[PDB]
Design an enzyme around this catalytic site. Structure first.
Site, PDB file in Angstrom:
ATOM      1  N   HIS A 146      14.526 -10.077  15.327  1.00  0.00           N
ATOM      2  CA  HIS A 146      14.806  -8.705  14.954  1.00  0.00           C
ATOM      3  C   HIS A 146      15.756  -8.070  15.963  1.00  0.00           C
ATOM      4  O   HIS A 146      16.069  -6.883  15.863  1.00  0.00           O
ATOM      5  CB  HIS A 146      13.502  -7.902  14.850  1.00  0.00           C
ATOM      6  N   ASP A 147      16.220  -8.868  16.928  1.00  0.00           N
ATOM      7  CA  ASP A 147      17.151  -8.377  17.948  1.00  0.00           C
ATOM      8  C   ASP A 147      18.473  -9.137  17.953  1.00  0.00           C
ATOM      9  O   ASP A 147      19.252  -9.031  18.904  1.00  0.00           O
ATOM     10  CB  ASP A 147      16.538  -8.458  19.351  1.00  0.00           C
ATOM     11  N   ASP A 183      20.657  -5.708  15.026  1.00  0.00           N
ATOM     12  CA  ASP A 183      19.801  -4.520  14.922  1.00  0.00           C
ATOM     13  C   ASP A 183      20.669  -3.293  14.642  1.00  0.00           C
ATOM     14  O   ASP A 183      21.616  -3.027  15.381  1.00  0.00           O
ATOM     15  CB  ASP A 183      19.040  -4.323  16.243  1.00  0.00           C
ATOM     16  N   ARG A 228       2.620 -11.999  22.130  1.00  0.00           N
ATOM     17  CA  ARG A 228       4.058 -12.096  22.397  1.00  0.00           C
ATOM     18  C   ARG A 228       4.341 -10.930  23.330  1.00  0.00           C
ATOM     19  O   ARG A 228       4.297  -9.773  22.918  1.00  0.00           O
ATOM     20  CB  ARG A 228       4.856 -11.960  21.094  1.00  0.00           C
ATOM     21  N   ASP A 264       6.351  -8.413  25.110  1.00  0.00           N
ATOM     22  CA  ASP A 264       7.600  -7.670  25.056  1.00  0.00           C
ATOM     23  C   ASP A 264       8.173  -7.382  26.449  1.00  0.00           C
ATOM     24  O   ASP A 264       7.461  -6.906  27.324  1.00  0.00           O
ATOM     25  CB  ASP A 264       7.363  -6.356  24.318  1.00  0.00           C
ATOM     26  N   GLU A 269       8.620 -12.564  26.181  1.00  0.00           N
ATOM     27  CA  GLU A 269       9.981 -12.375  25.718  1.00  0.00           C
ATOM     28  C   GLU A 269      10.901 -12.361  26.930  1.00  0.00           C
ATOM     29  O   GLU A 269      10.954 -11.381  27.662  1.00  0.00           O
ATOM     30  CB  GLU A 269      10.155 -11.059  24.952  1.00  0.00           C
ATOM     31  N   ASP A 324       3.937  -2.836   5.047  1.00  0.00           N
ATOM     32  CA  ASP A 324       2.610  -2.774   5.648  1.00  0.00           C
ATOM     33  C   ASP A 324       1.839  -4.082   5.624  1.00  0.00           C
ATOM     34  O   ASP A 324       2.283  -5.080   5.055  1.00  0.00           O
ATOM     35  CB  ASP A 324       1.776  -1.683   4.977  1.00  0.00           C
ATOM     36  N   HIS A 366       6.396  -0.823  29.009  1.00  0.00           N
ATOM     37  CA  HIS A 366       6.595   0.609  28.876  1.00  0.00           C
ATOM     38  C   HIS A 366       5.788   1.120  27.701  1.00  0.00           C
ATOM     39  O   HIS A 366       5.482   0.366  26.769  1.00  0.00           O
ATOM     40  CB  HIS A 366       8.074   0.920  28.639  1.00  0.00           C
ATOM     41  N   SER A 425       2.647   4.745   2.987  1.00  0.00           N
ATOM     42  CA  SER A 425       4.041   4.705   3.409  1.00  0.00           C
ATOM     43  C   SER A 425       4.473   6.042   4.019  1.00  0.00           C
ATOM     44  O   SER A 425       4.013   7.105   3.592  1.00  0.00           O
ATOM     45  CB  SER A 425       4.937   4.392   2.215  1.00  0.00           C
ATOM     46  N   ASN A 465       0.849  -1.188   0.000  1.00  0.00           N
ATOM     47  CA  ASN A 465       0.000   0.000   0.000  1.00  0.00           C
ATOM     48  C   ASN A 465       0.885   1.239   0.000  1.00  0.00           C
ATOM     49  O   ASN A 465       1.101   1.865   1.035  1.00  0.00           O
ATOM     50  CB  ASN A 465      -0.918   0.019   1.225  1.00  0.00           C
TER      51      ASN A 465
END
Ligand SMILES: OC[C@H]1O[C@H](OC[C@H]2O[C@H](O[C@H]3[C@H](O)[C@@H](O)[C@@H](O)O[C@@H]3CO)[C@H](O)[C@@H](O)[C@@H]2O)[C@H](O)[C@@H](O)[C@@H]1O
Ligand SMILES: OC[C@H]1O[C@H](OC[C@H]2O[C@H](O[C@H]3[C@H](O)[C@@H](O)[C@@H](O)O[C@@H]3CO)[C@H](O)[C@@H](O)[C@@H]2O)[C@H](O)[C@@H](O)[C@@H]1O
Lengths: 588, 588
Positions: B423-424, B468, B326, B328, B357, B174, B247, B153, B149
């Site tokens: 992604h970490d 990352d 999940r 965090d 996590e 997206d 947080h 963006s 899409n």
């Protein structure tokens, strides 16, 4: 160094918050295998120059059992977060013990190696009602304490103390008789009363409940209980009732219904039934306390059962203001039910002491979300083995005491219900084979031990009797029948316990004496005061060497008040058979 | 016999209910120090029926780590109550290990020496949704999966996959992009999708939430999400969202209010503020994730915060029917909150997978009252150290796996979220140094390992990048830059896993070879179903001799489908550099 003996895991007794900002951390290693241990610690997000910032804090050996040394360290995480490890030293050997195993030098390229205590939360903190720490409980079996109202006694009641009790005998004890003797308890020094079941039931022990919302008519009425409680509060005495939630009685209405209508009964799910109809022969086809047919196990997973028991639990607290609940066979009821129990009890009255009857290791019920304490039968066991039966040495006794103590967090041991006997054990004087001298030692150790001790009615005046029901004799009120030596002894100790804080909330450490077979030497210290206790557990007189410092040390005999200076390194205390002595220490 | 190495304690990974009628018990001893172990067990009240003699069951050695051997036994208590001890044989030596200590023979008296498992309650039982056990997840970082899409963006979105991602870069990924590529996932064999935060946030990662009740405008809207979830469901693909509850972001209205008003705002207690007004440096005067000022820690103890967060938890499940949360930075939120969290979520939809996590040992959150699993990063570490970095031998790898596996109950491990990267972390291909052969081994072991494995988008095609943000590059769609060999290797493995129960639910066992440094041999067992895996982790050919009973034994090369019987009694397999072969073992 023996790696197989080194241990730590970020929970239970090894890692816990002591308060809102302090964490306690323990480590156990092979006894005498490590010279020093340092705690490595830091905030998991404190980095500078690609270098995780951490510090080193030496850990103190707090004691040791048969196989290990236990190390201690407290730390206030700067931002309440922590990643840590342990650096062990021995000769030129060095070891960094972490969650990812052992290293030979502190790795700092990442925090993943280290154990973790993510965040210190006030909500997850273990916290028991502070007042139980200074309390000395007294356990009463109502049917046998005092007949203060002869008219409500069940017909067939035997003349007071006319004979030994049987599983079904009655002597007429009642709630009124307790009120009539409160002055006797106040004088003794008691500040807590623990009652065995008092709700309607057909037995003399009443652990097979018929109605949890009704005071047994033979013990009295609600007004009578309310008076007893208020009369107790007047004298600074807290009251704890027995909650028999694991099972009900054969005459519990819901069970009587399932008994008649089987599977169609609306109460069938309140129990654990394997087959319908229900039967007791040759054996119950439903779960029960032990294998007792008259005691159907309640299903605390049932929303109905749960609401009923919880109402019961809150009812007696809101309507009568009781100060504690002793959970009968607590370990057999699910954890989920106990979390709700606590929440509802603590919301209604934070000061309520939740005590569970668990004769074994009870760490899972003592994490802060359930009980405040359990009846410390492991303590009972160890103390009796050393003082009453003399089947273990002073060395082994110290090891056992250190073992059970280190198996729990410091704040847990501070609220522990330390008893020497109860209605489910034989009389201590009888376990001691009639030797009053031994019982005096039992009482000495119990009352100089951190926690919330409990005295079984009659033990203070030397009542005798083997295990249930012999341990349930009618309370002896005739002065010429009570053992005065014990009574004054117990009264004396309780008064001392009240004066010296290290006796009720301090740390206990055992000092090794030569001939670690009969001489028991230990001390209690809270950082402010230090009390040294020396016990000659032998049939002969003894000259026990007091391992202390020379010049500068002053001692005060707690029982006689005599003050004196310590000569040199040669301080030998002389005691008669089974003698003992307590000293307050002073270094100037 | 090293007593300091022996260990058991009734809880967590050593004693737990596997199901409503079965108990599991573990024992740890020094590796190769004990020859056999027998479980002494009975009902705690057997005495009532006169059953003082214990029943005996031999325990099975399930593995060994660097230091210990682990014993195992499952028991079906006749009445769901159990008292037990362990009899250890070191040859002629014989010790009875109990809660009370070691003895040379089981005590002849009626004293409570044994460990105890009070009662087996279905309600306390640890239970994760059964479907995760057959799920192979695919993790998606939306901002980088696909630009379906263009109109939504972010203003300055760089050309797709044109350059390396940065902490602040955008590429316009997206939800529509995911929807558009679902067919690709279907062909791959994926049955579950884990998305990172998709709620409104200014960043490209979105862990600093602005609003939990609003899908991010750049990611899409309500009907886009609904579509994706429906489209996935119509293909047997579960969807798990990322809950960032520890947080909130800087733009979180409640927080914007506090940074504006100060010690006056009605949201002061929603956070962890130490002083007013709020400061961002040197370090924030309020708790936050790490020390990021834009990520202030929420006060999950605050009834309002808790309510709002629990509303967020249920909201998305009820409205969009998601299948997993999940959590965090879960370890930094209190246990009380996670309990309420589990209750409300399972009440609303019992099938929801609650994954927290947590990179470290998480036993405290997996006792059955909180999470169903945690992201198993320790597994990631061991697997990368063996297959990618080659920093450890096959022996040490076998030990680490046995280590992290025996630290949890069997049912906890059967639902473990085993990932190889995220992604970490760095891209596995990069941690492998570009050797695609090594990456095939990672997938091989992952997809043959019990639990609910997860694949990081792009790894199935060999994308590269350091940690990352390098690992967060745009997904590569042009087949010319994909490496189809790896892609079919993973498609194949996902196929086999779905076909052999032993790979996703079975027990793992490591066999020991000669070159126990490069040769890895292990089998997955579940009933007679058995898969033997052999791995040559070297830079050259190897003839690995795998001992396996001959006779009525047939081998099924799962890669090719070839069948054949055993002849050499200790068959030899020839593998090229970093080669591997899977054999289904049939007993006829
Ligand atoms: O074995 C026949 C016996 O059955 C009933 O009594 C069973 C026991 O009930 C009580 O035991 C409780 C303890 O006092 C509590 O501290 C805790 O352990 O929970 C148990 C069960 O509720 C009672 O105290 C014992 O004396 C009994 O043996 C009948 O009521 C007895 O008459 C029979 O003898
Ligand atoms: O100070 C540098 C950085 O700070 C912020 O971002 C911090 C990190 O936030 C996210 O990290 C999350 C992980 O992805 C989750 O898996 C889990 O660990 O929780 C953390 C924190 O919620 C983000 O994914 C990372 O890339 C960030 O480093 C600012 O938002 C950034 O602009 C700053 O660069």
């Amino acid at each position: 160094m023996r790696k197989e003996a080194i241990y730590h895991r970020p929970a239970d007794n090894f890692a816990y918050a002591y308060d809102s900002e302090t964490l306690h951390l323990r480590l156990r290693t092979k006894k005498d295998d490590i010279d020093r241990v340092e705690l490595l610690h830091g905030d998991p997000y404190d980095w500078q120059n690609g270098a995780w910032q951490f510090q080193m804090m030496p850990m103190r050996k707090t004691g040791s059992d048969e196989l290990f040394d236990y190390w201690f360290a407290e730390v206030k995480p700067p931002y309440r977060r922590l990643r840590y490890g342990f650096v062990l030293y021995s000769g030129e050997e060095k070891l960094v013990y972490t969650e990812k195993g052992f290293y030979f030098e502190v790795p700092t390229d990442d925090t993943a190696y280290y154990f973790c205590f993510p965040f210190l939360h006030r909500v997850d903190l273990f916290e028991a009602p502070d007042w139980v720490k200074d309390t000395v409980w007294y356990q009463i079996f109502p049917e046998r304490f005092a007949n203060g109202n002869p008219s409500i006694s069940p017909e067939g009641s035997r003349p007071w103390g006319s004979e030994d009790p049987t599983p079904t005998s009655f002597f007429g004890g009642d709630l009124q008789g307790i009120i009539d003797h409160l002055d006797y308890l106040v004088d003794l020094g008691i500040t807590g009363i623990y009652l065995t079941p008092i709700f309607r039931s057909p037995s003399n022990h009443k652990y097979d409940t018929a109605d949890y919302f009704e005071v047994d008519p033979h013990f009295g009425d609600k007004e009578t209980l309310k008076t007893l409680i208020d009369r107790c509060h007047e004298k600074g005495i807290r009251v704890m009732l027995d909650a028999v939630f694991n099972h009900c009685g054969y005459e519990f209405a819901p069970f009587q219904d399932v008994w008649k209508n089987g599977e169609s009964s609306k109460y069938k799910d309140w129990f654990h039934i394997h087959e319908f109809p229900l039967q007791t022969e040759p054996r119950p086809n439903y779960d029960t306390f032990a294998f007792v047919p008259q005691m159907p196990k309640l299903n605390t997973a049932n929303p109905e059962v749960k609401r009923y028991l919880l109402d019961v639990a809150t009812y007696w607290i809101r309507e009568f203001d009781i100060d504690g609940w002793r959970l009968d066979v607590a370990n057999e009821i699910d954890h989920e039910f106990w979390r709700e129990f606590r929440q509802e009890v603590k919301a209604l009255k934070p000061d309520v002491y939740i005590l569970g009857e668990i004769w074994h290791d009870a760490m899972p019920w003592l994490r802060g979300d359930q009980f405040d304490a359990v009846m410390n039968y492991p303590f009972t066991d160890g103390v009796l083995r050393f003082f009453a039966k003399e089947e273990i040495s002073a060395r082994q006794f110290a090891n056992q005491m250190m073992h059970v103590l280190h198996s729990y967090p410091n704040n847990v041991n501070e609220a522990a219900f330390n008893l020497l006997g109860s209605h489910d054990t034989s009389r201590i004087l009888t376990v001691c084979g009639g030797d009053i001298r031994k019982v005096k030692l039992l009482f000495l150790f119990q009352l100089t031990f951190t926690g919330s001790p409990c005295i079984y009615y009659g033990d203070e005046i030397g009542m005798t009797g083997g295990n249930d029901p012999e341990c349930r004799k009618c309370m002896v009120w005739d002065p010429m029948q009570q053992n005065k030596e014990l009574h004054q002894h117990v009264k004396q100790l309780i008064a001392l316990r009240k004066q010296y804080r290290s006796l009720r909330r301090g740390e206990i450490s055992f000092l090794h004496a030569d001939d670690e077979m009969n001489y028991l030497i230990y001390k209690k210290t809270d950082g402010d005061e230090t009390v040294l206790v020396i016990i000659n557990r032998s049939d002969q007189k003894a000259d026990i060497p007091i391992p202390l410092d020379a010049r500068g040390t002053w001692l005060v005999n707690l029982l006689t008040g005599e003050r004196f200076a310590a000569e040199a390194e040669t301080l030998c205390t002389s005691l008669p058979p089974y003698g003992f002595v307590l000293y307050a220490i002073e270094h100037w």
